[PDB]
Design a protein around this ligand. Structure first.
Ligand SMILES: [Zn+2]
Ligand SMILES: [Zn+2]
Ligand SMILES: [Zn+2]
Lengths: 72, 4
């Protein structure tokens, strides 16, 4: 497996999963989100003001589905 | 992670 680590741009949508996130600050970039199991879950979008980073691949941030199709 |  691998980590995404993408740092978000100003105005960029970010996605948490209300079902799987360990904390509400755990998020995925749109590419990882759309490649993840969480696209079928109760997701929550927060817009980045510039900064923050994608937690795809962080096995401590997600109760299930820590990776997306791209990073698995 | 992100923080508003
Ligand atoms: Zn990502
Ligand atoms: Zn990913
Ligand atoms: Zn989920």
């Amino acid at each position: 497996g691998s980590l995404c680590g993408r740092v978000f741009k100003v105005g960029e949508p970010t996605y948490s999963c209300r079902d799987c996130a360990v904390d509400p600050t755990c998020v995925l970039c749109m590419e990882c989100f759309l490649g993840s199991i969480h696209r079928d879950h109760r997701y929550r979008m927060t817009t980045s003001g510039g900064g923050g980073f994608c937690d795809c691949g962080d096995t401590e941030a997600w109760k299930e589905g820590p990776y997306c199709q791209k990073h698995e | 992670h992100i923080f508003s």
